[PDB]
Amino acid sequence: MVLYFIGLGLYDERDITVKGLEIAKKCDYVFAEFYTSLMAGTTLGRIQKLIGKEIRVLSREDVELNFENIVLPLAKENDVAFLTPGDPLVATTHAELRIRAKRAGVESYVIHAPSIYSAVGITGLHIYKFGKSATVAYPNGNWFPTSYYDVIKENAERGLHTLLFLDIKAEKRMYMTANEAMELLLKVEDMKKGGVFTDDTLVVVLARAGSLNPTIRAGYVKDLIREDFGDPPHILIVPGKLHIVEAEYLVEIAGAPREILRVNV
Amino acid sequence: MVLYFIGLGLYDERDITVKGLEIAKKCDYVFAEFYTSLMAGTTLGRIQKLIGKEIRVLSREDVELNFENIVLPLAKENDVAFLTPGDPLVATTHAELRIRAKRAGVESYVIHAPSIYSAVGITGLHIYKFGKSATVAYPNGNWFPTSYYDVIKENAERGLHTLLFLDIKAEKRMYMTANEAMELLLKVEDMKKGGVFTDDTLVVVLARAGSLNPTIRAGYVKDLIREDFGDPPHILIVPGKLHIVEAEYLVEIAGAPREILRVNV
Ligand SMILES: Nc1ncnc2c1ncn2[C@@H]1O[C@H](CSCC[C@H](N)C(=O)O)[C@@H](O)[C@H]1O
């Protein structure tokens, strides 16, 4: 009669909360989805071993089309867990699943875990200064999406930072790198000429957040566009005007050039 | 020797990540602060029992003025942990403490935990649609803060949601309720008259996120301003223009008036 939405956190199998782990262990059935994002620092086997339960992985279609036929039936007469990378319900499509549960007469509870949305605090950038978020999508065929560029423009002109989630080919475990994202933005700039993203733009790259050794780097595009930030996942941030305290953290912790203390504050 | 900043999460001691618990358990000295937020579902005793170590609680003054004299000295020859509610670097000024650590020759690491900043996803509002955030601060004497009102205006103008962290006075055990926040906003509205926050404004209240049964309510200020949302902590959200699915969740899950289902595109 109960469905638990449990977040797995940022990077590896230990990023789940003690609460989520203990509840997961007592559930009769455990499902999981790895299409909204991936857990790059672990494997399904390591997660299974930690929880001590078989993990039934579900595809985007299984969830979007058949959640009520695959998960809810069992949740009706058993305690069921639905694991998701990060924090449950951050992914836009997750919330609606709680309505399906209600419609099926199934109780649902949410067990939170760290999300990249809040983990970016490790960049030294003030969380309240982040504006609207966006996703940099790979251009495909005759389709070249560019809305993420406008998001940066609108946030930056208000002195706000822009968090850019990078595209992922979940089914192929292929992550877009911050380098590729920078190349794409420079390409959109050349097409829109809004003076939003150029070689002189200050950016921040956060790689493998959650890991004990994430890569945190800040600098101008011209210098970071070909830098190696390590293994995925990568997150790209285009900060707005900085508070001196943010700038000093970027210089001391993220290796930003001293120049940002006078150009971007 | 090392210094770990470890988040304890949203509500109780089990909101810490498995990673954070594993590391905290093996540290030589454990410090913590409980003035940046309120964990309504636990006690110092239960947290101490979980990590198996005595926890030295520090006041805001101990931290801001003497972190380098109380904590860092030990981190030079021992493994030290510094615990905080939620995520240690979200809506706090703790990031600056990493700079103090560096200058003291002490390496520091960050272990994330569930944060209210991302937990708001449980309200059904799309996380990417949240704009700049703000804090509703208790007026002090003749000084009446109002910057948060302008933030709401700026976000709403762009169709974005506004997350409003509510004030806290730990040493005085004062935790601002959503009701008090609403009263303050109505007063600012009478003073500025921007039509930003009135009795007809739709708002969302999230109380005690992290617990299994948090209070999630949506409705007009006129109706919720005197409603009992339970014990603190509380957070208030002023949604921008709603997507149809957001409206559906607010009605089905947060008990919002069915009339909001009719979005004015
Ligand atoms: N469990 C919870 N439920 C509702 N609001 C919460 C909350 N935890 C924190 N807040 C809100 O945030 C304020 C503290 S701001 C510090 C937040 C913390 N670093 C984090 O990551 O969550 C509180 O006064 C309250 O308004």
SS (HEC) of B53-65: CCEEECCHHHHHH
Check the annotation: does A87 bind a ligand.
yes
DSSP codes, A64-98: HHHHHHHTHHHHHHSEEEEEESBSTT-STTHHHHH
Contact B10, B114 (CB under 8 A): yes
Closest CA to B138 of B187, B92, B100, B91: B187
Written as one letter, the residue type at A100 is: R
Rounded to whole angstroms, what are the CA distances from A40 to A8, A53, A174, A175, A209?
12, 20, 10, 10, 10
Distance CA(B233)–CA(B122), nearest Å, equals 16
Distance CA(B108)–CA(B5), nearest Å, equals 7
For A216, phi and psi rounded to 5 degrees? -125, 110
Strand partners, A6: A83, A111
Task: Region of A101 please: left (phi>0), alpha (psi -120 to 50) or beta.
Answer: alpha
Q: Give me the half-sphere count of Cα atoms (radius 13 Å) on the Cβ side of residue B180.
A: 17
Q: Give me the half-sphere count of Cα atoms (radius 13 Å) on the Cβ side of residue A36.
A: 26
Considering Cα of A220, then A226, then A230, then A234, what sign does the dihedral take? positive
Helices A94-103 and B244-253, packing angle to 10 deg = 40
> What architecture is the A1-114 domain classified under in CATH?
3-Layer(aba) Sandwich (3.40)
Which residue does chain A place closest to B155, by CA atoms?
A131
Mutation test of ligand 1: which of B97, B116, B179 has the most ligand atoms closer than 8 Å to its C-beta? B116
Q: Which two tokens stand for residue A22?
A: 């203990």
Closest CA to A56 of A16, A26, A28: A28
Q: Which among B21, B210, B249 has CB closest to A112?
A: B210
Distance CA(A10)–CA(B190), nearest Å, equals 44
Residues of B in contact with A132 (CB under 8 A): 128-131, 158, 160
Q: Do B127 and A110 touch (CB under 8 A)?
A: no
β-pairing, A56-58 vs A29-33, is: parallel
Query: What SS3 class is residue B3?
Result: strand
Domains A1-114 and A115-265 share a fold: no
**Which of B87, B132, B157, B160 is most worth mutating to test chain A (most A CB atoms within 10 A of its CB)?**
B132
Contact A197, A127 (CB under 8 A): no
Distance CA(A65)–CA(B217), nearest Å, equals 29
Residues of B in contact with A129 (CB under 8 A): 132
Closest CA to B151 of B114, B119, B185, B180: B185
Task: Region of A197 please: left (phi>0), alpha (psi -120 to 50) or beta.
Answer: beta
- The number of residues making up chain A comes to 265
Q: Which among A19, A127, A160 has CB closest to B14?
A: A19
Helices B44-51 and B18-25, packing angle to 10 deg = 80
* Approach to solving: X-ray
User: What is the distance in A from the centroid of ligand 1 to the CA of A52?
Assistant: 32
**Which of A64, A132, A154, A213 is most worth mutating to test chain B (most B CB atoms within 10 A of its CB)?**
A132
Q: Which among B114, B129, B154 has CB closest to A17?
A: B114
Distance CA(B257)–CA(B252), nearest Å, equals 10
**Rg of chain B's alpha carbons, rounded to an integer?**
20
Which residues, 6 or more positions from B164, have their beta carbon under 8 angstroms from its beta carbon?
B133, B134, B135, B136, B148, B152, B181, B235, B236, B237, B238
Q: Which two tokens stand for residue A95?
A: 């919330």
Strand partners, B21: none
Query: CATH number of the domain at B115-265, please?
Result: 3.30.950.10
Locate the domains of chain B by residue range: 1-114, 115-265
Contacts from A175-178 at CB under 8 Å and sequence distance 24+? A175/A38, A175/A40, A175/A232, A175/A233, A175/A234, A176/A136, A176/A138, A176/A234, A177/A229, A177/A232, A177/A234, A178/A203, A178/A205, A178/A207, A178/A224, A178/A229, A178/A234, A178/A235, A178/A236
Contact B176, B166 (CB under 8 A): yes
Check the annotation: does B253 bind a ligand.
no
Written as one letter, the residue type at B73 is: P
Check the annotation: does A166 bind a ligand.
yes
Q: Which two tokens stand for residue B96?
A: 């600056």
Closest CA to A17 of B209, B215, B21, B110: B21
Check the annotation: does A116 bind a ligand.
yes
User: Is the shortest distance between the CB of B98 and ligand 1 below 6 Å?
Assistant: no
User: What is the distance in A from the centroid of ligand 1 to the CA of B174?
Assistant: 14
Query: How many Å separate Cα B218 from the centre of its chain?
Result: 19
Query: How many Å separate Cα B252 from the centre of its chain?
Result: 25
DSSP codes, A89-152: T-STTHHHHHHHHHHTT-EEEEE----HHHHGGGGT--GGGB---EEEPPPBTTB---HHHHHH
Rounded to whole angstroms, what are the CA distances from B37 to A117, A209, A234, B62, B197?
19, 23, 30, 16, 26
Question: For A224-243, b where at least 16 C-beta lie within 10 A, e where not — what string?
Answer: bbeeebeebbbbbbbbbebe
Written as one letter, the residue type at B211 is: S
Breaks (C-N over 2.5 A) in chain B follow: none
Quick one: B83 exposed, middle or buried, by C-beta within 10 A (0-12, 13-18, 19+)? buried
